[PDB]
Amino acid sequence: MSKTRVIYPGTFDPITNGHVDLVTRASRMFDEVVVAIAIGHHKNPLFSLEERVALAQSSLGHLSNVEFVGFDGLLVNFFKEQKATAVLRGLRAVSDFEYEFQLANMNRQLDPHFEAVFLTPSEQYSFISSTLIREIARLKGDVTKFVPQAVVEAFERKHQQGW
Template identity: 65%
Template sequence: MTSHTRVVYPGTFDPMTNGHLDLVERASNLFDEVVVAIAASEKKKPLFDLQQRIELAQEVVAHLPNVEVKGFRKLLVHFCQEEKANVLLRGLRAVSDFEYEFQLANMNRALDPGIETAFLTPSEHLSFISSSLVREISGLNGDVSPFVPAPVLAALKAKHG
């Protein structure tokens, strides 16, 4: 007998990139349910507000029936508890990500030993993409079309002209 697994994939997603989408699509094949959890992260001064990021992500993952998108403004483990999710999904682009992610995973485990962290690496051709680079390139009127889904590209063009 297999158990039903609900995973939370948290992030700021400002904006969602093809790397994020790659992880969501692969997670949707590994887990019964995937919750893309978009952190408010007001301290980061996001380019898109929380509602815009939620709507963009919903549009991007609409083709995945077992994926839902939700925003949150609380401690991540509390969000996972409310969602009845016992797995956190994190992406690792490079070895440089590992130390920070390892620290986060251990802190989350200390806060709630019932929540495990699973790591996925993006497809190789997407491993260099980051939201901050996309924002920077887009803000300087560079072409980010290879790095983001179409709805995100349209939103970036509307934002930057």
């Protein structure tokens, strides 16, 4: 009867149609969804925080219950700051499933209030990762089918500053 707030953390480098599916799905089951972009100070993304948030907003802004925020630090401290109900993650593969079980268990020890829920992607998005998309763009392949148009354009505007 209170009000539910789920955080969806990630690097979103860049956001993909995969991520869009998950946020949309999550937006139907929870009151507020926060798309939370890990800055990644000492981890070196392709797109800046500003590009990453912008492409996210461009792609999911039409959902009234979705917020977008950059963060760094310990996910559990962010979790607490945001007074969240749970963290959402997607599970694509067996390695994902194992990493995430570990992380959830660790975070529960750091904050007993912590929680993690998981969605699995529809089969149309099961093969999409950011990394794979970077690599395909990088080799002048066509990523239109896997990402929003804004992201296509953003890839062209790095191929324009050279890349």
